[PDB]
Enzyme design. Structure first.
Site, PDB file in Angstrom:
ATOM      1  CG  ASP A  50      -1.907   2.311   6.358  1.00 51.63           C
ATOM      2  OD1 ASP A  50      -1.690   2.147   5.106  1.00 51.63           O
ATOM      3  OD2 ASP A  50      -2.706   3.160   6.872  1.00 51.63           O
TER       4      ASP A  50
ATOM      5  CG  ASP B 180      -2.178   7.361   0.404  1.00 54.14           C
ATOM      6  OD1 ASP B 180      -1.483   8.341   0.085  1.00 54.14           O
ATOM      7  OD2 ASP B 180      -3.096   6.896  -0.297  1.00 54.14           O
TER       8      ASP B 180
ATOM      9  CG  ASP C 152      -1.790   1.305   1.161  1.00 54.32           C
ATOM     10  OD1 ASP C 152      -2.471   1.631   0.157  1.00 54.32           O
ATOM     11  OD2 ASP C 152      -1.736   2.011   2.178  1.00 54.32           O
TER      12      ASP C 152
HETATM   13 CL   LIG Z   1      -5.737   1.798   1.007  1.00 54.98          CL
HETATM   14 MG   LIG Z   2      -2.738   3.227   3.432  1.00 57.34          MG
END
Ligand SMILES: [Cl-]
Ligand SMILES: [Mg+2]
Ligand SMILES: [Cl-]
Ligand SMILES: [Mg+2]
Lengths: 327, 327
Positions: free
Chosen positions: A262, A33, A31
């Site tokens: 995350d 961000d 991922d």
């Molecule tokens: Cl995401």
């Molecule tokens: Mg993220």
């Protein structure tokens, strides 16, 4: 490249995996961000462009005015605040919307703004509604995680292909992940994110990078003067869509040896379903509510794996770090 | 229920599968169009509504006007023709579009038209462009396959849960699959298709069945007077979105023991990645070219499952029938 900005036990595990899996056609998925860099590209670029007066209710594609605006005599509701109210309807509403909201701009233009944003290094004030009162907030621009920058590179160096699978607009993410100046050095074709139709303002032609790539005619430079439109291409790269993206764009059968995330719901399909049996689940713990969510998911998925007659892998090889540990 | 409208050898294989899996928490997944009934709901309902003068260009949601219409002085381009040109850009354009085009009707209005369409029986003339040539065809309204009606019910009677995963609008498909009148008796909450935001114009609420069903608060009757909007909810239930839908809405680890389809690309991910090791690939062979493509794909996936350390199941337990055999 060596794993400097990593807790040593985290570094030992990644090193073990990298070494075990070197030059064998393996791959990893990150991922973006809050996983590859701290903070969130779209969530800071949006209130940044609003502040600059570039992105306004007036320029917003009409197809994105899904609900009435919530205006006070004091105050026009911001796009940022509108977004938050869309997420209160559902993730599945506001996730596409916050990529689409950049429609109307060419890629060259957005690229200027991303880099502007990336260099800004101050919080950006945004207003929203806490229930009914106008609240306010500072949104950080993204900050590159030195550790991820290093791990991306060490993977590449050992013949382990690096992919990004992001719930953010693929073109925006690519503007960071694949621009060498940010040090990730991801291949642009290996950046996978939310895709909307890009429009040639001269011919009317509609295209996307994913189509060019599948057809083996991808030129990133040629897309720069195309205008982002809101029309949604799929797989939509969030939640089970991240796993769809891996099957669609990476491999139908070979599983990534490492997956990084995350956000428990958004990233959990590729973390749990994607990660190869002996792969690492890389987790950026940024939030207690999230750490708890993912721990229950580990328990539910380990029991479900066993019940289904599968090796129990949901709870294997977690490498867990906090943003500060890898900054 | 007996499997009367099946070739006897396909009946035996399906019977064997059912007996091995009866009342064990197993499930099956069917595509709808051209797999559960013959022909195609949206591709016939669109030109049916055009012929009726109910669905016209000026009625078309604005966000759906992606490219100029191609009119010659003699002839105004039909929406059906427009759809086919969108497909020439990409499937990923025209799949969402041909569900979205029914935006601006309530579910109740659409149900009236679907039942009408389903009762009409005759082909529906439509035009499209053959490159530059105006070309003609007769679109067939759906015809319930008696054998699939039987197989849905025989599964369910044996405690094998039935799901529909369709690349048509979830709500349109539910109008056939879950209405006892057509004899499939699918549970409405088990009908999974292309979902778009539904608007309650009385209260302002935007919702979808998928959202209601995940919140544990679904009543199909409650939604009848909501307006279809075009805003795309996801997973989008085609190609890899079918597999994403299985994971999101059915089960994260347990695999279906039968998966049925008819379109090699759109059904292929659930067929190949979804089907349980021991499960049946039910194939409704309506086009020699598709039969050739699926056989090709079986070869390719059998070999790739092998080259990935997995037991080769791509080529296993195929029950292949023509529409005529299960009509
Ligand atoms: Cl995401
Ligand atoms: Mg993220
Ligand atoms: Cl389909
Ligand atoms: Mg079909």
């Amino acid at each position: 490249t060596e794993l400097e900005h990593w807790p040593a036990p985290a570094a030992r595990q990644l090193n073990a995996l990298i070494e075990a899996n070197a030059n064998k056609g393996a791959y990893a998925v990150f991922d973006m961000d809050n996983t590859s860099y701290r903070y969130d590209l779209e969530e800071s670029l949006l209130p940044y462009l609003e502040m600059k007066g570039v992105l306004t209710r007036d320029r917003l594609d009409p197809s994105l005015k899904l609900i009435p605006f919530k205006d006070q005599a004091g105050h026009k509701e911001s796009l940022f605040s509108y977004y938050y109210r869309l997420c209160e309807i559902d993730d599945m509403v506001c996730y596409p919307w916050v990529a689409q909201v950049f429609s109307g701009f060419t890629l060259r233009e957005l690229k200027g703004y991303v880099d502007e944003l990336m260099a800004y290094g101050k919080p950006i004030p945004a207003t929203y509604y806490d229930g009914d009162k106008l609240a306010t907030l500072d949104v950080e621009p993204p900050r590159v995680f030195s550790g991820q920058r290093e791990l991306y590179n060490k993977l590449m160096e050992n013949g382990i292909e690096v992919y990004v699978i992001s719930a953010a607009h693929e073109e925006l993410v690519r503007m960071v992940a694949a621009d060498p100046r940010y040090g990730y050095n991801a291949k642009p074709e290996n950046v996978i994110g939310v895709t909307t139709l890009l429009k040639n303002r001269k011919t009317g032609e509609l295209t996307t990078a994913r189509k060019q790539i599948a057809e083996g005619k991808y030129d990133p430079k040629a897309n720069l003067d195309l205008e982002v439109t809101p029309y949604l291409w799929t797989p939509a790269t969030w939640m089970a869509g991240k796993q769809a993206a891996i099957l669609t764009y990476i491999d139908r059968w070979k599983r990534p040896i490492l997956v990084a995330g995350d956000t428990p719901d958004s990233d959990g399909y590729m973390l749990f379903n994607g990660t190869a049996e002996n792969g690492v689940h890389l987790w950026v713990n940024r939030k207690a509510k999230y750490m708890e969510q993912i721990n229950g998911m580990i328990k539910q998925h380990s029991a479900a794996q066993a019940k289904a007659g599968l090796p129990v892998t949901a709870d294997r090889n977690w490498v867990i770090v906090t943003p500060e540990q890898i900054q």
